[PDB]
């Protein structure tokens, strides 16, 4: 028996990215905005970021710290940081991130 059905959806490159340039670029760059440069390469990370995107203060410290919790959705998180993982760079720049979030 033949396969049930498969819809035709693929468009040509000319119709795709030199005629719908604005929506194409909008969607492409909306896929990955909050991810870090060394982190964006992974599709799992991209999906995690999209679901995460789907408190203003907490957002401020998150965007100031940068690489803290971009793909989060056992170990409970404390008010300042996570028990298991605490990098030296974060320990050094905690105060700078705090003041940057305060200014934001």
């Amino acid at each position: 028996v033949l396969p049930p059905h498969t819809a035709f959806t693929a468009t040509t490159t000319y119709r795709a990215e030199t005629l719908n340039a604005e929506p194409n670029t909008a969607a492409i760059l909306d896929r990955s905005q909050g991810l870090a440069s060394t982190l964006v390469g992974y599709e799992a990370a991209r999906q995690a970021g999209e679901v995460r995107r789907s408190d203003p203060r907490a957002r401020a410290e998150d965007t100031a710290r940068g690489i803290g919790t971009q793909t989060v959705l056992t170990v409970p998180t404390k008010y300042g940081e996570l028990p298991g993982y605490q990098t030296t760079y974060g320990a050094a720049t905690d105060k700078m991130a705090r003041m940057q979030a305060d200014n934001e």
């Binding site: 396969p3 498969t6 035709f8 959806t9 693929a10 468009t11 040509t12």
Partner: protein, 426 residues
């Protein structure tokens, strides 16, 4: 615009063509009642290359079936997409060649080839601009070999300046279905080297090996083998039917692949091929397609590509892709395996990109190589032919019908000088 008409010869050719037409109809969104039910406008654009509109949305394939036994016609009519064909392209004899090349080329041909030429003419100047003919057949049988090759000779005489693709499945000693396979094959290829424009070489052993290793199937039936071949046919003709970033039609494929007029037997393969278990553990990238493309275990011929050198190669790609990645992927694979490529030709790989992959996939590809490894297969059949001709075994069925020993002698000479030319250029 560009036109391709199809001819189906013999039992194997008829089944392969039936599967091919099913696949093409699914791709173009026409249901087996001959009516259109596609969704995207991209399907309407190039349905004149394979179909004709009759009346009220009825699309009929541009194909001609030709055989000698009602069993094949009944089998292709019973199955799905069997009622879309054309009853007057159902041109048809009654006796049966009985796996005899002399019977297929001299006895029943003399009374069916007039009719098949009349119908193929009618359909050929029914259209405006022919691009090529497309005939699918075997090289071991009786009906598809002899009558098919005489049809090729007639078409070459009547239209000299059109492309012609002949999709030929070839025999092997390991899979011998008839005892006169080298006898039929030698004469068929003797006619092909002088009349055919280019042939796609296929064989059952490599298809079974693929279904064993890569597909990991347990029951690789003839339907499955014909489905693989039909997918390859759709892949090679995809450029004429869909737009791409770098278009490559049949004639430029020929001029890029063929360096010398006699070297037009090409080995072909398809990607991606993954099992149901391993489809979830695999990526879909240009390097991922390339490593499978250039694998020897992906090949659908019983000839080791690493046993010789590649004269030329071509890679058709389907999907939205990075032309840069394609270019440096071919460049890197050529630089790495430098010994296996010919030296006096730089840039041995011609790559093309199209924007429409097959339905349900993300990225697909077809590989067409013109290498010198097929001289092994030609020696393989030549030794068998000499061994049986040494004492004229099984020969009187040809001699008593009109065949003479001279034709066998010229066929042997052609095989010898062809493999000599392969060895010379290797």
């Amino acid at each position: 615009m560009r036109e391709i008409v199809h001819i189906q010869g013999g039992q194997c050719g008829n089944q392969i063509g039936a599967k091919f037409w099913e696949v093409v109809s699914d791709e173009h969104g026409i249901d087996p009642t001959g009516t259109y039910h596609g969704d995207s406008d991209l399907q309407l654009e190039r349905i004149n290359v394979y179909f004709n509109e009759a009346t009220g949305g009825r699309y009929v394939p541009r194909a001609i079936l030709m055989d000698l036994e009602p069993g094949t016609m009944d089998s292709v009519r019973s199955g799905p997409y069997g009622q879309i064909f054309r009853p007057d392209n159902f041109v048809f004899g009654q006796t049966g060649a009985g796996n005899n090349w002399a019977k297929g080329h001299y006895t029943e041909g003399a009374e069916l080839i007039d009719s098949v030429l009349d119908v193929v003419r009618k359909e050929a100047e029914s259209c405006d601009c022919l691009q090529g003919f497309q005939v699918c057949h075997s090289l071991g049988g009786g009906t598809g070999s002899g009558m098919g090759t005489l049809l090729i000779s007639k078409i070459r005489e009547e239209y000299p300046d059109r492309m012609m693709l002949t999709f030929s499945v070839v025999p092997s000693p390991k899979v011998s279905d008839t005892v006169v396979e080298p006898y039929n094959a030698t004469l068929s290829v003797h006619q092909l080297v002088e009349n055919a424009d280019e042939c796609m070489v296929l064989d059952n052993e490599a298809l079974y090996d693929i279904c064993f290793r890569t597909l990991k199937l347990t029951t690789p039936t003839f339907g499955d083998l014909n489905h693989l071949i039909s997918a390859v046919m759709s892949g090679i003709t995809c450029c004429l039917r869909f737009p791409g970033q770098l278009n490559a039609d049949l004639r430029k494929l020929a001029v890029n692949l063929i360096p010398f007029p006699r070297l037009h037997f090409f080995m072909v393969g398809f990607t991606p091929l993954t099992s149901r278990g391993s489809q979830q553990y695999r990526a879909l990238t240009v390097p991922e397609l390339t490593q499978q493309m250039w694998d020897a275990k992906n090949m659908m011929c019983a000839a080791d590509p690493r046993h010789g050198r590649y004269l030329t190669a071509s890679a058709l790609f389907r999907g939205r892709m990075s032309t840069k990645e394609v270019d440096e992927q071919m460049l890197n694979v050529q630089n790495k395996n430098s010994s296996y490529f010919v030296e006096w030709i730089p840039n041995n790989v011609k790559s093309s990109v199209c924007d429409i992959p097959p339905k349900g996939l993300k990225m697909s590809a077809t590989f067409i190589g013109n290498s010198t490894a097929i001289q092994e297969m030609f020696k393989r059949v030549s030794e068998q032919f000499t061994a049986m001709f040494r004492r004229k075994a099984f020969l009187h069925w040809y001699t008593g019908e009109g065949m003479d020993e001279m034709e066998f002698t010229e066929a042997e000479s052609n095989m010898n000088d062809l493999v000599s030319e392969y060895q010379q250029y290797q």
